[PDB]
Design a protein around this ligand. Structure first.
Ligand SMILES: Nc1ncnc2c1ncn2[C@H]1CC[C@@H](COP(=O)(O)OP(=O)(O)OP(=O)(O)O)O1
Ligand SMILES: [Ca+2]
Ligand SMILES: [Ca+2]
Ligand SMILES: [Ca+2]
Length: 341
DNA sequence: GGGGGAAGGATTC
DNA sequence: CATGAATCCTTCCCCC
């Protein structure tokens, strides 16, 4: 079992560098402008020139400008990046029949049968890196190891524009030295619950009862961390299928007025249906971000598919339910369609 | 008791 | 100052 994980470097900004080469060398910041006020919004991603100074995804646009008032700030263009992403995704296929597209910029390849080992795999790595670089002018980092989890950790260590392998030998070392937090699927919330338990390393999960681990971080997470530590993690490369489609927007200002919120809600629905393109959902959820950044949601599943007319009237009821069951204002309103026929 | 689903939230990338 | 989606978790609930 050999897995080759491909991760496109600072993807959104790099695509902007490609569509306009004169941006190379300068700090590029791709952000999302919320409408709320002068430069309100967050940074979606930035190139490394910008990351050297603390400007990264997540921080407010207003914060990035204080640090880098002369960097190039560009509005995110998701559609463009998706098409470029797809074209790259179609190149990888040719290197493997078993391909799992994790996200718009990550993918896992089952190259167990394309090679026989870690020399031909590494070589297959460069083979792909160059193919992509020449065809799309995009640099990507490649990680290679026995399973998906370590493959990804390989790229995490290699990026940007790198390629690294983690032989069964080094896997044994990491399962003992690697900060559990750096393990995919382990965010801050989980990384902490693990420290209070004394688990600062993958192996440490072996020195604890499974029942306390289940109790603290959940069964699914417990078995995951344990198998990995036991060095028996072996998840296959599957074809992820879209289970849901939605869209959430930010309002000009918070509010609890149905008539002031509807337009944004309807706009979110219109876009969601456009993206459904032929897909018919039987379930609908209205999602709302409260003034204090809380996420509330009310939904409903129908025994039949949902028409735009139904979604329209139903979303208003779920929005009214939200308001009747939560005093806070709404900062962002949206919808999500699931359970496709 | 326990299957099976639905609803609302928790987490992560 | 704060911008799509999968998976998992907990709580119900209907029911044989
Ligand atoms: N805060 C965000 N807002 C919008 N899109 C985001 C955000 N964070 C990440 N993404 C998207 C765009 C890039 C993609 C990559 O996943 P991830 O952030 O986990 O790896 P990464 O940090 O290597 O990505 P990259 O460097 O290309 O931006 O996910
Ligand atoms: Ca990535
Ligand atoms: Ca990336
Ligand atoms: Ca982490």
């Amino acid at each position: 079992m050999i897995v080759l994980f491909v991760d496109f470097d600072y993807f959104y900004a790099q695509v902007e560098e490609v569509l306009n080469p004169s941006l190379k060398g300068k700090p590029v910041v791709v952000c999302v402008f919320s409408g709320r006020f002068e430069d309100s919004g967050a940074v979606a991603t930035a190139n490394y020139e910008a990351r050297k100074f603390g400007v990264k995804a997540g921080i407010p646009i207003v914060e990035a400008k204080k640090i880098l008032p002369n960097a190039v700030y560009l509005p995110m263009r998701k559609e463009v990046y998706q098409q470029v992403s797809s074209r790259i995704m179609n190149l990888l296929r040719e290197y493997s029949e078993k391909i799992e597209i994790a996200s718009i910029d990550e993918a896992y390849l089952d190259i167990s049968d394309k090679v026989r080992d870690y020399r031909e795999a590494y070589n297959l790595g460069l083979e792909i890196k160059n193919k992509i670089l020449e065809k799309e002018k995009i640099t990507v980092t490649v990680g290679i190891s026995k399973n998906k989890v370590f493959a990804k950790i390989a790229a995490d260590m290699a990026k940007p524009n790198g390629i690294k392998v983690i032989d069964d030998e080094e896997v044994k070392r990491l399962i003992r030295e690697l900060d559990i937090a750096d393990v995919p699927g382990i965010g801050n919330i989980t990384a902490e619950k693990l420290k209070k338990l004394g688990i600062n390393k993958l192996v440490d999960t072996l020195s604890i009862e499974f029942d306390k681990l289940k109790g603290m971080i959940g069964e699914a997470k417990a078995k995951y961390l344990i198998s990995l530590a036991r060095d028996e993690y072996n998840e296959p490369i599957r074809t992820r299928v879209r289970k849901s489609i939605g869209r959430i927007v930010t309002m000009k200002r918070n509010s609890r007025n149905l008539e002031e919120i509807k337009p944004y809600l309807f706009r979110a629905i219109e876009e969601s249906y456009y993206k459904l393109d032929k897909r018919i959902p039987k379930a609908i959820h209205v999602v709302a971000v409260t003034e204090d950044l809380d996420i509330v949601s009310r939904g409903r599943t129908f025994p039949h598919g949902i028409s735009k007319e139904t979604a329209y009237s139903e979303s208003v009821k779920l929005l009214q339910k939200i308001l009747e069951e939560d005093e806070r204002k709404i900062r962002r309103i949206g919808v999500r369609f699931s359970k496709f026929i």
